[PDB]
Design a protein around this nucleic acid. Structure first.
Lengths: 218, 203, 203, 218
DNA sequence: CAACCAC
DNA sequence: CAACCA
DNA sequence: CAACCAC
DNA sequence: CAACCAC
DNA sequence: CAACCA
DNA sequence: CAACCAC
């Protein structure tokens, strides 16, 4: 019944039920089924830092597709593992991976890059807050850490990241669809990752999942 | 006269009789690819720890035991976590599908595991829980205790046929899925998986 | 008067109109795990090489091209065969399932591949055909030609929706599954997969 | 419809339809759906030779289960690959794998073993026929070969075996079910494999599939 | 509380 | 509770 | 929630 | 025959 | 045709 | 079919 109605739907549009009615699940303005979108990747983290846009969703009929240019992201579910490489783990040290889920109210360009948005002493991600000028544009919705420790004879090779986070965030795109950061006219959810230890890196195998609904507004 | 049978508290709705247990005591050899076992496997019969009809409600699962490392593996310095998933298959068939072909994930990594985008209507994850164990030459955390009681009102329907097999389940079959986070070396899991069920008043 | 339309020979039953072609020209990078592509992917529209309704009959598939080895791989002495399977998925959904999770086989070996015991009702193998290529330092068989016409009366039903996507197919979707027999090194396959179809008289 | 009737069948017995009626597919005497049974294995072949029983099927309600002690094997489908190991393939030589699908009308014991049934000069599998005395007991239903050639600079590492073969063969078991060669009261289908080259071995990754129907007779 | 068993 | 699916 | 910024 | 196009 | 399934 | 043996 769940699956049938979506396949047997009228050509270009959602099933009638969705159009009609509203679950308590869906936020204000927006309608339709809770569409998912996933970013599965092994991110190689550094001291300088890494970025990715997690609102990157293309436009289309089906599921995992925005319909219009506007849509509301209701929640983000980051899950996976951060870990040390087999040659690095021998060396005795510790590193926390700093995750910052930020929003930029006025986005453009390809990517902002870490340390060109976060102000910090000696390029240190633990002392990181938004820059004086960009403070208006960028806001940190969530931040969360994850520790990993190397050692010759005894090591903590890996750490499991599992973090659900609800953030009712409305985003607006261009007319053209590419599922790219460049296309976002309104705010776009960015995940910024940074390794606390200066020299050696850490890996982060992550599924970043994002849950969203299509906007009726405008 | 005929009074209605006052079903006692702490039995599920549409179910009666004594609470019947069913145990699956085993040493599971856990891997990165992932192990499976069906925990709704219970035979039909007049004996105790058998179902009577085709319908019954599991009220609660009790997983208890130990995860541990072998004597040659424990010397090697690493960490690894066993990822328990108790999942419900709503509309099952055939052999129980392997951890790899139910859960989708990056590089066969169980920490990134969620139910496949295609067959998400079919399977649901009821409970998940981790358990970490650390190797080390001079200082190891050889073992880790598992003690996990979980109340789930799961009504399984069976095939007409009598057998304690997965093929028989018509709907809501219970699978326990296990997987080790570290790729190379394995882990043992000595586990008693106990299940507490009541037979349905219907049929 | 109204005479019935004498449908010409060499069009399928319940189908009429001109025979429309559809091509999928590509260099496929073949592996041991196995590659897939849907060959019933055709969009809805008034243009040529589009379907009109949701129903149409593929009458014939024409696979032609070349399997070949890279300049660094061809020096290494081995043999490897590409195993083409043209399979029908009767009742499809979602993303097209990977070669590994449709076909069951010993040690992921495509030569031992048959459709999984569970989902055997769903998938059928219409045609299979091999193509061997041999490496060698001094004397190699670098490449192998593929030329294979196959008449299959396959009636696909689509989703209401217009799109040339696999998700849309309601039934009888056509998948071409490819897999290399040798485990280590890969093979290229420059292929034109052409498909010859007629639109259904119904709807 | 196909799948539903088998799951919704009456408890201990086949669907009514099968009981009633007979397809042209099923052989004489026997009834019911065409039950399959598979033996997927990497067989390590030698000059002395290897054996396996391919009628090994256990007893039970479902598919891939015999019901009674009697059943008819209609066809065998051997498919897979024979191949040379990475260190062996360097050496220049040739070997054919000789497959013999034989039937022993009066089987017992664990396995007969190759060269204790086949008579041959200098233990050579190419000169192999059934022994003078056992000739009555054993019959070769099919034989088929497959060549593989080693070489330092140019080799034929592997060869694809694909062989369907129809052989309406009725077999009878003990009362007890173990899916073992020992249990066969009547004839059992045995596959005998042998490498033609004396010294080095060859591997054989094979799915041996067998198609059978349950007997109404006796 | 521990885990279908009791107080 | 797990993570849009019941 | 994170930290004077915004929803 | 080659592969929706023709003789 | 592929291999018990349409 | 394989090779005096059997179905």
């Amino acid at each position: 019944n769940r699956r049938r109605t979506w396949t047997n739907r009228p050509m270009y549009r959602k099933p009638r039920l969705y159009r009609m009615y509203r679950t308590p699940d869906v936020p204000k303005g927006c309608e339709g089924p809770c569409k998912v979108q996933s970013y599965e990747q092994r991110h190689d983290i550094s001291h300088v830092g890494k970025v990715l846009c997690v609102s990157d969703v293309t436009r289309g009929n089906g599921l995992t597709h925005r319909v219009g240019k506007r849509f509301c992201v209701k929640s983000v579910y980051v899950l996976g593992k951060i870990w040390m490489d087999e040659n690095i783990k021998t060396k005795n040290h510790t590193n926390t991976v700093m995750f910052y889920l930020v929003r930029d109210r006025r986005p453009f360009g390809t990517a902002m890059d870490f340390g060109q948005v976060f102000n910090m002493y000696d390029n240190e991600p633990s002392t990181a807050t938004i820059k004086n000028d960009l403070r208006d544009r960028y806001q940190v919705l969530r931040k969360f850490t994850s520790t990993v420790t190397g050692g010759q004879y005894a090591s903590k090779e890996q750490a499991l990241v599992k973090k659900f986070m609800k953030i009712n965030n409305y985003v607006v795109y261009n007319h053209q669809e590419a599922a790219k950061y460049d296309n976002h006219t309104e705010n776009a959810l960015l995940l910024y990752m940074a390794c606390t230890h200066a020299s050696n890196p850490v890996y982060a195998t992550l599924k970043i999942r994002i849950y969203f609904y299509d906007s009726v507004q405008n």
